[PDB]
Design an enzyme around this catalytic site. Sequence first.
Site, short mmCIF file in Angstrom:
data_model
loop_
_atom_site.label_atom_id
_atom_site.label_comp_id
_atom_site.label_asym_id
_atom_site.label_seq_id
_atom_site.Cartn_x
_atom_site.Cartn_y
_atom_site.Cartn_z
CG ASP A 1 -7.94 -30.54 -21.04
OD1 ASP A 1 -8.45 -29.75 -21.88
OD2 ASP A 1 -8.45 -30.59 -19.90
N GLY B 1 -10.91 -29.58 -9.16
CA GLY B 1 -10.05 -29.76 -10.31
C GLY B 1 -10.57 -30.82 -11.27
CG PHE C 1 -11.37 -36.64 -14.01
CD1 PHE C 1 -12.69 -36.73 -14.44
CD2 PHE C 1 -10.37 -36.54 -14.97
CE1 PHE C 1 -13.00 -36.73 -15.79
CE2 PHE C 1 -10.68 -36.54 -16.32
CZ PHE C 1 -12.00 -36.64 -16.73
N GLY D 1 -10.17 -25.99 -4.60
CA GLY D 1 -11.30 -26.06 -5.52
C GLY D 1 -11.45 -27.37 -6.28
#
Lengths: 261, 261
Positions: free
Chosen positions: B129, B19, B21, B17
Amino acid sequence: DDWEIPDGQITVGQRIGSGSFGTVYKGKWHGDVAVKMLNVTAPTPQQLQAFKNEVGVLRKTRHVNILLFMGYSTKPQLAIVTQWCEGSSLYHHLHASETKFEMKKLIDIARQTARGMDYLHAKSIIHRDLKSNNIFLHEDNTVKIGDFGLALSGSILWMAPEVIRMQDSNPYSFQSDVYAFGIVLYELMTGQLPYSNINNRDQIIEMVGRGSLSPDLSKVRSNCPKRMKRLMAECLKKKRDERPSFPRILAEIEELARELS
Amino acid sequence: DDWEIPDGQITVGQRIGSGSFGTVYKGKWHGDVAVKMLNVTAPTPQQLQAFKNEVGVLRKTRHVNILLFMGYSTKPQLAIVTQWCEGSSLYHHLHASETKFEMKKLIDIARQTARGMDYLHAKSIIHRDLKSNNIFLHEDNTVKIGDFGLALSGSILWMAPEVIRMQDSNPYSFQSDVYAFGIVLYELMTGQLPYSNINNRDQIIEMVGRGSLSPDLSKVRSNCPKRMKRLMAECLKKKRDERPSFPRILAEIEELARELS
Ligand SMILES: O=C(c1c(F)ccc(NS(=O)(=O)c2ccc(C(F)(F)F)cc2)c1F)c1c[nH]c2ncc(Cl)cc12
Ligand SMILES: O=C(c1c(F)ccc(NS(=O)(=O)c2ccc(C(F)(F)F)cc2)c1F)c1c[nH]c2ncc(Cl)cc12
């Protein structure tokens, strides 16, 4: 350098046991770690150089099936710090317990060990002491190849004929690593150590050297794949250069694992 | 350098899938790996410099609770290669499944996440993050902190007031990492995302910024330890410098885990 862990940061805990050239302890450093305190006190220039070389090699390893190097200490003494593994060695599971793994599990362990060795050899790293007691089953599931060596004559069974002969100064190679892996495969598939019916250690050394004694492959389990028995014989070939290399060994065992799930 | 993986060595497999960047793929390289192919094509000098910086930071991480960096590629395009993790993210377990973890398990996940963050901060690395979708439960057991980001507004709930305000150019710090961890603790103890009763994203941003809106800690589960609720409130303190640092956060959660086994 940046992998040096300053003194005082690690809380040293339980004495686990005598490892290879050191004493292993469980420790606390941002969670759990293992800490091998090397036996050497007042190291010579060549012992300090050898320590820096080994840290340099360990720094090149980043693979799930290789015991994770985390850092080292210099003072008050030399030490290697790694991840803490839960459980016991492959040697313990196979030769010091009444637990019997199913063939799917045995082949999974062979596969993961092959992944680690294939990785090491791709980076031109020779282990030199591959055996079941240097393979840990972290959480009873994940192979971690390292230098555990917990309680030499205790590597004789994994030595290729050219190593055991000691007819040259450095008989260790990728190929001798493959032979040792072949003996690990023997351990997995038979559940046993080779040459258990011979009680003389000096006679095992002489006969493996001259090619008159080899592992009895008829002892593999009934549901050991024919391809695994063939591959094992290839890994154990007495002539150094007739043995396979790890890319092919890995590919074949991976397919055996894939068929079982 | 020595972590560069030459082209052709990795067999790229299933597209997992989108992610952070990049696009993540499962791959084969001495076993299983994950490979994030970065979106950037024809990178500028500053994009190549930023890539080298990030590889430099990842090279400094060797801890079981940090996703294991394994290498990178330059050609035909930029890519980061890591260990493959089995299972799903913490976000999936908590907010996209009917599986309900017991409190022992929740506290174990909090402990391991704290181990990883304590490690990062000790090496002066700020994640920037931290959130449940960037925490993977490898084999449903081991926390792996990374940069997964699989299917921004999808980090707003974990942003400290000073980050969300954006009143300065670099509001990211150890302290803002601690706040995000406090929100992860909220996710574990309540099983929910904060501010779920407010349907306006712009109003969440404004109110968290001015300190008029904070997570509703009355929603923690009945068997959430009082000490965990207290610790969580400390991590979520609106004033940056009133929050704890990770050595103490880790020590307290470790003791909560120890009492439960
Ligand atoms: O015995 C050790 C140990 C240690 F403390 C320090 C270093 C090592 N090995 S090592 O020197 O780092 C090492 C040596 C060689 C390799 C390889 F595979 F060749 F690359 C990998 C690692 C250990 F095996 C353990 C490490 N983690 C553990 N967890 C539990 C137990 Cl009971 C022992 C240990
Ligand atoms: O999504 C990723 C992935 C990837 F492919 C490449 C790089 C990363 N993250 S990372 O850039 O290396 C990284 C970034 C930051 C950190 C930290 F924690 F800050 F130190 C650690 C690692 C990933 F999370 C996965 C890695 N292993 C996986 N296994 C399964 C799945 Cl579904 C995804 C992944």
